């Protein structure tokens, strides 16, 4: 399906906890949960 988007937002989580603002990574995590359940 959206495997491109999934890979990209996982990359975003990677870089985002490689940032310092460790919090939006987890938001994107629940977003991926939302994708998988839908």
């Amino acid at each position: 399906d959206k495997e491109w988007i999934l890979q990209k937002i996982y990359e975003i989580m990677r870089l985002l906890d490689e940032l310092x603002d460790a919090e939006a990574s987890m938001r994107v995590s629940d977003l991926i949960y939302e994708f998988m359940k839908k």
């Binding site: 495997e3 996982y10 987890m26 629940d30 949960y33």
Partner: protein, 99 residues
């Protein structure tokens, strides 16, 4: 049972309450009428610069069974791609780095 759960997700502990941060590595079965207390642990258990101490597999093939708790080095999969750490489109090692 004791475990780590972040602040604005605390409420998610409920019978039949799935989720992402509250489900992929923990789950309570229905029919437990009891109490749970959450609270700040930062006065002693926190540190500036990323508390590199917690972890939970952010990906799994389904939810958990009643009070199920099983360790797994297994990667998540969309296809059947054998990956042992290399980040592909579906290799997906579920390591969520709580720092």
């Amino acid at each position: 049972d004791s475990f780590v759960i972040r602040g604005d997700e605390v409420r998610q502990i409920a019978p039949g309450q799935t989720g992402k941060i509250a489900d992929y590595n923990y789950k309570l079965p229905d029919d437990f009428t009891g109490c749970v207390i959450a609270w700040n642990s930062n006065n002693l258990d926190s540190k500036v610069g990323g508390n590199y101490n917690y972890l939970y597999r952010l990906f799994r093939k389904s939810n958990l069974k009643p009070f199920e708790r099983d360790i797994s080095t297994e990667i998540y999969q969309a296809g059947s791609t054998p990956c042992n750490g290399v980040e592909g489109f579906n290799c997906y090692f579920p390591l969520q780095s709580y720092g």
